[PDB]
Design a protein around this nucleic acid. Structure first.
Ligand SMILES: [Mg+2]
Ligand SMILES: [Mg+2]
Ligand SMILES: [Mg+2]
Ligand SMILES: [Mg+2]
Ligand SMILES: [Mg+2]
Ligand SMILES: [Mg+2]
Ligand SMILES: [Mg+2]
Ligand SMILES: [Mg+2]
Ligand SMILES: [Mg+2]
Ligand SMILES: [Mg+2]
Ligand SMILES: [Mg+2]
Ligand SMILES: [Mg+2]
Ligand SMILES: [Mg+2]
Ligand SMILES: [Mg+2]
Lengths: 102, 115, 100, 82, 126, 151, 100
RNA sequence: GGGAACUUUAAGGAUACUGCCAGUGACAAACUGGAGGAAGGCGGGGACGACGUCAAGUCAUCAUGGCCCUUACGGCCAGGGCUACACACGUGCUACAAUGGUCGGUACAAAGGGUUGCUACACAGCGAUGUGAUGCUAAUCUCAAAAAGCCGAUCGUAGUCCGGAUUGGAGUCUGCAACUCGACUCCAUGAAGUCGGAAUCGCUAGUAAUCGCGGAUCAGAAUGCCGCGGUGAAUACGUUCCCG
């Protein structure tokens, strides 16, 4: 699946982050393989230039071959935490959808 | 027939057939045929020796293959040697007339090179 | 826009107004056939020697109320942001919404 | 290309500096910012330093360069590879 | 002698009808000259072959606006209305044919945010 | 749709032969609204086929169309998570439409110089009984025959 | 032989019709003969104005302004008719041009 | 010369209301089939965005609370950059040809723009254009050639008489000035491409597909955006499984 990850001005992005995100996301979602053709993750900081418990928003939206695109959001205090929460939520959502459609 | 050292197609109109020589297009072919007196729709297989000689004489007046190729190469290498901006673009094999190289420069750089 | 931007625009307009007559005369001399070649060349040199801001090509349209350099809409003289407000308040004569 | 009837374009200050240099015999470079001027046939044999954005690069004008603009010999971008 | 007006897709036709040998002129031109397309000629000719009295009338026609199909439709509508004006008993058969009706279909305008009246840009979900 | 019953539009008969069937065939051939070129193609094909054997072109066309029309088709029914292709009869309008589409597609995939020539070749082939449209008719019969068991 | 040509331009057709009716009535009182009013093709001018401050290209307001023109001729006019026409007052929104 | 008939132009009016007939339904709303009519059951389009949702977007149109700089985080200027190029995505344009390319002849629009402008017409040039000159403040003069289309000839399935990227010479114009970095013209060159993975998008009628024309921005610089007309389709048995 092709991976298209984007951030905002607050978050700060780099090709190193691109490689790491691609690797981790593929490693987690390797089982589905052909079922899914596209991932797009997006990162923001909400109240940019300030702080808080969450203060960062991760999103991941995935296109499954066949059924319609499905999206997931998460809020966390760090980029890694946001990514992990979003990955867990995507895994749960895809498992539920695939069990439903059988 | 063989004009300027190349065998042009035989089963073709003369105007279309002459455009198989480097350095001659449809305009030049029309000019040559007007000078000789040959009708454009006439096919090359219908021409006799005298017409072939006339066409060769006309074509010799224009630079076609070696004269044109060496002239073009000399200009390009002159630019590359002098080192102007166009010469540097020639050296690096990138668009020479000001096109975008961020995307769509595949006619100069060729197939995409993976990292 | 900034007051510096607006003042630069105003000084450019003032310079263009100052030098319009000489610029036009020099261009006419340049385009005059009966005039001598040396006279035409001297006219060209003077036109090239005129101050840069005298050239109208260096002027940018601005809203007037706000000085914004985009969406100018020559006829009204206002950029879209203020033109919409003035129109939909009812202060611009003849202008209404379009449905056809 | 500039229309022939208008003729070549050269800045007045650069032109005057060039005439002073040719009238005298001094090889000191002529420092200038006029990348838009044309290399006139009288420019040959002179060293002219042309601004390229942050520094002045020298150019020794030879017969080949006539017809080019000054800026064509002073590249403005620094690229060394990806 | 009897006049009719026809309209179709921005085209308007003025038709004058008077008993005659069968002449048919359009803008100082013949049907074959004006319409190089056979469907247009067939459409122009339907109304009077419908009554089986084609050559017992003479027609003088002017047309303006639209294209070949619209002009042909307008000319036919004008001929039908001229026949109705000439005789009242023609209207039921002409309406049964459907020529009495005036077609109201017209081009739909382009709309904001869309490439055309109905077509809209691509929304890819690949 | 979920409601209403849309009425069918009327196709005027063709100029030469005054046939609504031939007009509909021209509409199938037509591309980009170039109906004049569509008529040219169809009439050239009809003249070409008439040249081979002296018969009424309209009668030949309708006979070949009857030869190529389908009998029975299946419509996929999704129950119990399975395809369940169920044979069913089809209305005459669908019969004619599929016949015309098959003829035109087979002609398009033939290998002559011009559309008129290859359409005429397809009509001759369908009249003989060996063509791509004939093969699609055979395949649909074969599949609806394999699945006859279900209602 | 003298004929007076009258041209009315406005942004409001009701106002321009009122003006033309008043002119023809004034001419009738004087007793001259007048041709018109003759409607002339209306000019339409349509503009697209973005309504969002920053980024929404599809969300716009479409405005229009219309120019209405009316033509009048008065023929065989008398000295009292011309003075009456000059004396007649002019209302705003209707620009009137008088040609001898 | 004339006419005020027709087309048109642009204000004001009429018309269409299940109005009438035959059926259905509680004898209710309402729903089917008909006559007449240009139009028959919201005729077709456009504006018009309920209470509310996402600390959704905009301190860079603008205003504004609170913080920050004050010989610089303010102001003037000349050059350069925003156009970079191992790559990855989104939206498009042009093609891969014979339902077509080229050449000659020959018909039919609608909407807009024009006085710092549009320019008839003659000459010069292969051409972009230049000179002289004419009518226009415009239902008057002009942009302006509509193109697909029709008739005749050639091409005869070839990377081609398909395609027009890239590069080499020679120019026009706008502008103080086209090097970085403009649009267009002529000669020469002739690239990938021979119909495109999984996947996925738009569209129910004058719609889709296809063909040309105009405008705002603007000295000049549209394949983008907003409009205009020409030719003109395919298919809906049905709501069972797809989603909201
Ligand atoms: Mg926020
Ligand atoms: Mg400010
Ligand atoms: Mg400007
Ligand atoms: Mg050049
Ligand atoms: Mg259209
Ligand atoms: Mg419309
Ligand atoms: Mg409402
Ligand atoms: Mg933000
Ligand atoms: Mg900001
Ligand atoms: Mg600067
Ligand atoms: Mg940019
Ligand atoms: Mg070609
Ligand atoms: Mg190849
Ligand atoms: Mg412009």
């Amino acid at each position: 699946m092709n991976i298209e990850i984007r951030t905002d001005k607050n978050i700060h992005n780099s090709e190193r982050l691109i490689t790491y995100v691609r690797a981790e996301l593929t490693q987690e979602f390797q089982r589905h393989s052909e079922r899914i053709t596209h991932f797009s993750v997006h990162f923001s900081d909400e109240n940019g230039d300030k702080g808080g418990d969450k203060d960062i928003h991760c999103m991941i939206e995935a296109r499954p071959s066949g059924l319609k695109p499905v999206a997931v959001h998460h809020k966390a205090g760090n980029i890694d935490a946001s990514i992990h929460g979003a990955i867990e939520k995507l895994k749960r959502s895809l498992e539920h959808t695939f069990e439903k459609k059988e | 027939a063989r004009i300027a050292g190349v065998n042009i197609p035989d089963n073709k109109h003369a105007v279309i057939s002459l455009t198989y020589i480097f350095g001659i297009g449809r305009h030049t072919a029309k000019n040559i045929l007007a000078a000789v007196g040959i009708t454009e729709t006439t096919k090359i297989r219908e021409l006799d020796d005298a017409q072939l000689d006339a066409i060769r004489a006309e074509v010799a007046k224009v630079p076609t293959e070696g004269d044109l190729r060496r002239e073009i190469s000399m200009n390009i290498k002159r630019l590359m040697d002098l080192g102007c901006y166009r010469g540097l673009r020639h050296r690096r094999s990138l668009p020479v007339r000001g096109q975008r190289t961020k995307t769509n420069a595949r006619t100069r750089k060729g197939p995409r090179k993976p990292i | 826009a900034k007051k510096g931007m607006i003042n630069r625009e105003l000084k450019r307009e003032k310079t263009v107004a100052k030098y319009a007559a000489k610029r036009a005369e020099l261009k006419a001399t340049i385009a005059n056939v009966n005039a001598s070649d040396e006279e035409r060349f001297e006219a060209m040199l003077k036109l090239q020697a005129l101050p840069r801001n005298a050239s109208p090509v260096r002027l940018r349209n601005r809203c007037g109320l706000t000085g914004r350099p985009h969406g100018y809409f020559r006829k009204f003289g206002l950029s879209r942001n203020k033109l919409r407000d003035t129109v939909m308040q009812g202060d611009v004569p003849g202008v209404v919404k379009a449905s056809w | 290309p500039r229309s022939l009837k208008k003729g070549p374009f050269v800045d007045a200050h650069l032109f005057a500096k060039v005439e002073a240099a040719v009238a005298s015999n001094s090889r000191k470079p002529i420092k200038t910012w006029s990348r838009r001027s044309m290399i006139l046939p009288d420019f040959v044999g002179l060293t002219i330093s042309v601004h390229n954005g942050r520094n002045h690069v020298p150019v020794i004008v030879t017969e080949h360069m006539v017809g080019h603009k000054l800026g064509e010999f002073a590249p403005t971008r620094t690229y060394r590879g990806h | 002698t009897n006049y009719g007006t026809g309209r179709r897709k921005t085209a308007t036709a003025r038709v004058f009808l008077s008993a005659g040998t069968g002449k048919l002129v359009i803008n100082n031109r013949t049907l074959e000259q004006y319409f190089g397309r056979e469907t247009a000629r067939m459409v122009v000719r339907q109304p009077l072959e419908l009554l089986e009295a084609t050559e017992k009338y003479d027609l003088y026609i002017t047309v303006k606006g639209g294209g070949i199909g619209g002009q042909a439709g307008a000319i036919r509508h004008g001929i039908t209305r001229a026949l109705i004006a000439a005789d009242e008993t023609l209207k039921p058969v002409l309406r049964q044919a459907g020529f009495v009706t005036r077609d109201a279909r017209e081009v739909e305008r382009k709309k904001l945010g869309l490439r055309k009246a109905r077509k809209r840009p691509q929304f890819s979900k690949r | 749709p979920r409601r209403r019953v849309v009425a069918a539009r009327e196709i005027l008969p063709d100029p030469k032969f005054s046939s609504q069937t031939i007009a509909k065939f021209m509409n199938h051939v037509m591309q980009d609204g170039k109906k004049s070129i569509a008529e040219s193609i169809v009439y050239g094909a009809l003249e070409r086929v008439q040249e081979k054997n002296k018969v009424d072109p309209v009668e030949f066309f309708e006979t070949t169309l009857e030869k190529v029309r389908p009998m029975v088709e299946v419509k996929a029914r999704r129950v119990g998570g399975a395809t369940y292709q169920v044979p069913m009869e089809v209305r005459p309008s669908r019969r004619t439409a599929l016949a015309m589409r098959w003829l035109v597609d087979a002609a398009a995939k033939r290998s002559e110089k011009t559309m008129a020539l290859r359409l005429a070749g397809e009509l001759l082939d369908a009249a003989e009984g060996k063509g791509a449209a004939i093969k699609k008719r055979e395949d649909v019969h074969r599949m609806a025959e394999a699945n006859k068991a279900f209602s | 032989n003298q004929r007076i040509r009258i041209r009315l331009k406005s942004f409001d057709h009701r106002l321009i019709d009122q003006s033309a009716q008043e002119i023809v009535e004034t001419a009738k009182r004087t007793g001259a003969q007048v041709c018109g009013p003759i409607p002339m093709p209306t000019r339409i001018e349509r503009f697209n104005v973005l309504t969002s401050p920053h980024v929404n290209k599809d969300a716009r307001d479409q405005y229009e302004i219309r120019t209405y023109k009316r033509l009048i001729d008065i023929v065989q006019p008398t000295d009292k008719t011309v003075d009456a026409l000059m004396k007649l007052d002019l209302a705003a929104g209707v620009d009137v041009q008088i040609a001898l």
